[PDB]
Design a protein around this ligand. Structure first.
Ligand code: STS
Ligand code: NAG
Ligand code: NAG
Ligand code: NAG
Ligand code: ZN
Length: 696
């Protein structure tokens, strides 16, 4: 009783070609499940990571290029904009002819780039101050330097917005890089050379005189500034407790508890905060409430700042925006990035311009692009089947609450509470197809010119930032999706207490109404449990049914969670990762994702078990000597057939909240008794340790 459908033939062939049945599943299940993929595939030059998951994202791009590249008479305005933005984006000759000019037009208006100016002090240092300068970059261009102010949702009341202050992101991927030795040396060297190179082009294009030594002089000074700011930022592992993280102040407290002396002042938080909010005609009292994520960093900032010029400061501040612009300029500007992105990413070339451009438009017009994607590529009934799967898996989670010995009764009850309260977002929002007005109106204020890509993307930064800040006194809309449809991913929002599964992830190998349920439950089913479980991981457990940051745990149950979850900190902490040169994974920074994998997979199996009990076994797949319990786990693993470039592995072992795909397979299956029953694994086989972690 082999299935011999078209769709069964496709499924089986993919499973076969990926796997290496030469390998004992119980010795190394990633090798087993993925061995044939590993043999046949080399990472593309434009890829920092490649794998089945990334391939889906490459395939989604092909769809986007098809729906963006050809004007259609009936196209509503919203989509004409997307396509026009697309067209402005793929015209390189237009862009190459403008050189850097579009940036030079731009410089004066963020207070300059001193290293690339004459008499910066005469021109600006007058007008200059750090209030005014940090605030420009932030409110006009959304670039967050020195101090990150951001209108956001309020962790303690999910219907409101607040102003946040947090530590900024850095020009290198993580604070660790600023060690600048060993595995980090090239990066630091490439980074400053890239500074240097960009500032030389501008001086040249300005026809200014070029003194290499002073360039190095000033760009090294920028680096040692950023080094200090790096050392002053808190680690991820010390940022992971949302109750620790949430400290609400008035500007008043802030001004009196977190003083800064920049240049010679010192710093007017009130002034700073109004230069930003001013940008949207809103008024801020020194009595305004602010959520402060990074108190210690602010503290630490004081002595640092007092030590550098306005020139030094602005040289870092402007470069952190310029950084991001130069690949939207001509080829010579493009080129100066070459060695820096190689150092961070290991890639030797830019991705295709049409793909970059397809993704950028998706980024900036996600509902419009998403309408098109769904029309071309998304069936419409996938989404009913997924709705029902989500009901199944949510029920299973609830069930398991009874068999979990490390919570107390009341705590279980609240856990069921919060779970009943999860609200699910599947595929796309019908609005974006049925309601033309609403889609046109989201982009009303935008007007693109097909020969001015750089103007266009400037405008999108302004619009974006205008939008966000004006939410301050507005409620949160509970209609709002937190992802477009044309995205290969899924999401949990603890503020919305909501799970989202875009059209883009609802395809093989994760999902098809035509593929075997075993494949479904091991793919998208595992994914739905992942997302649910995040509501109850080491961040999400802190948020309640309404998305509010408030404790609903007993001290005992909370402490047991920490204890149970500690097992995963150690297990994963202990993997060493060849591609990153033998470093251990960070067990703390991945914990949330690892909890979500182990809970999510177990949930999904039990939901497959529950399915088979009710509907009976499935017909087997042709060409494969495996039953469906076995297939369930095959497919789980094959989602993550993939590899990394060493450079990116070094980047990602610090920056990714996920474990690398291979250790996710191995991580979770070692903790799963079901798996080892599937493949008759000996006690103490590599895949089957006697000691096993469990939380959800
Ligand atoms: S946090 C959502 C999760 C969704 C997911 C869970 C389980 C299996 C596949 C995807 C996920 N998205 C990713 C994006 N990049 C790398 C790893 C990722 N993991
Ligand atoms: C590229 O942009 C320039 C604008 O100067 C235009 O003349 C040229 O025809 C454009 N090419 C395409 C294919 O649209
Ligand atoms: C902020 O303070 C500066 C100091 O020069 C002042 O010029 C500016 O008008 C002030 N703006 C706001 C929003 O208070
Ligand atoms: C490996 O597990 C052991 C035993 O708990 C633990 O002491 C050690 O810290 C773990 N390794 C890492 C790097 O976390
Ligand atoms: Zn996740």
């Amino acid at each position: 009783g082999i299935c011999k459908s078209s769709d069964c033939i496709k499924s089986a062939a993919r499973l076969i070609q990926n796997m290496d049945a030469t390998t004992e599943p119980c010795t190394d299940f990633f090798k087993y499940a993925c061995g044939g993929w590993l043999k046949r595939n080399v990472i593309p030059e434009t890829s920092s990571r490649y794998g089945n998951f990334d391939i889906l994202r490459d395939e989604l791009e092909v769809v986007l290029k098809d729906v963006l590249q050809e004007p259609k008479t009936e196209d509503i305005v919203a989509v004409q904009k997307a396509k026009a933005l697309y067209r402005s984006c793929i015209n390189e000759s237009a862009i190459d002819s403008r050189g850097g000019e579009p940036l030079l037009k731009l410089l004066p208006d963020i207070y300059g780039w001193p290293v690339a100016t004459e008499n910066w002090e005469q021109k600006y240092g007058a007008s200059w101050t750090a209030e005014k300068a940090i605030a420009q970059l932030n409110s006009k261009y959304g670039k967050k330097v020195l101090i990150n102010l951001f209108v956001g949702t309020d962790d303690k009341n999910s219907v409101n917005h607040v102003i946040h202050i947090d530590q900024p992101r850095l020009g290198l991927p993580s604070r660790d890089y600023y060690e600048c030795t060993g595995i980090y040396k090239e990066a630091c060297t490439a980074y400053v050379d890239f500074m240097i190179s960009v500032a030389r082009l501008i001086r040249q294009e300005e026809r200014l005189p070029i003194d290499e030594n002073q360039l190095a002089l000033e760009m090294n000074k920028v680096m040692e500034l950023e080094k200090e700011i790096a050392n002053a930022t808190a680690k991820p592992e010390d940022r992971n407790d949302p109750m620790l993280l949430y400290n609400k102040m008035t500007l008043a407290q802030i001004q009196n508890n977190f003083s800064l002396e920049i240049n010679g002042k010192p710093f007017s938080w009130l002034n700073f905060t109004n230069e930003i909010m001013s940008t949207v005609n809103i008024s801020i009292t020194n009595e305004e409430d602010v959520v402060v994520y990074a108190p210690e960093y602010l503290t630490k900032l004081k002595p640092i700042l007092t030590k550098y010029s306005a020139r030094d400061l602005q040289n870092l501040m402007s470069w952190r925006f310029i950084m991001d612009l130069v690949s939207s300029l001509s080829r010579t500007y493009k080129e100066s990035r070459n060695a820096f992105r190689k150092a961070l990413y290991g890639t030797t070339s830019e991705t295709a311009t049409w793909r970059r451009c397809a993704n950028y438009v998706n980024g900036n017009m996600e509902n419009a692009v998403g309408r098109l994607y769904v029309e071309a590529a998304f069936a419409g009934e996938s989404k009913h089947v997924v709705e029902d799967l989500i009901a199944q898996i949510r029920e299973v989670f609830i069930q398991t609450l009874d068999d979990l010995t490390w919570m107390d009764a009341e705590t279980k009850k609240r856990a069921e509470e919060k779970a009943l309260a999860i609200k699910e977002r599947i595929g796309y929002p019908d609005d974006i197809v049925s309601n033309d007005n609403k889609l046109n109106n989201e982009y009303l204020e935008l007007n693109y010119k097909e020969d001015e890509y750089f103007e266009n993307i400037i405008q999108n930064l302004k619009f974006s930032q205008s939008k966000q800040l004006k939410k301050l006194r507005e409620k949160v809309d509970k209609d709002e999706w937190i992802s477009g449809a044309a995205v290969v991913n899924a999401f949990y929002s603890s503020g919305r207490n909501q799970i989202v599964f875009p059209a883009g992830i609802l395809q093989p190998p994760f999902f098809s109404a035509q593929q075997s349920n075993s494949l479904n439950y091991g793919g998208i089913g595992m994914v739905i449990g992942h997302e649910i479980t995040h509501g109850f991981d080491d961040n999400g457990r802190n948020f309640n049914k309404d998305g509010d940051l408030v404790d609903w745990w007993t001290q005992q149950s909370a402490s047991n969670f920490k204890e149970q979850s500690q097992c995963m900190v150690y297990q994963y902490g202990n993997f060493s990762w060849d591609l990153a040169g033998g470093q251990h994974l960070n067990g703390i920074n991945t914990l949330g994702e690892n909890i979500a994998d182990n809970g999510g997979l177990g949930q999904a199996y039990r939901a497959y078990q529950n399915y088979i009990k009710k509907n009976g076994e499935e017909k087997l797949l042709p060409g494969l000597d495996l039953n469906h319990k076995q297939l369930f786990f095959l497919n789980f693993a094959q989602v993550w057939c993939g590899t990394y470039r060493p450079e990116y592995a070094v980047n990602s072992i610090k920056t990714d909240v996920h474990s690398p795909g291979n250790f996710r397979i191995i991580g979770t299956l070692q903790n799963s008794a079901e798996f080892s029953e599937a493949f008759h694994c000996r006690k103490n086989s590599y895949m089957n340790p006697e000691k096993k972690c469990r939380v959800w």
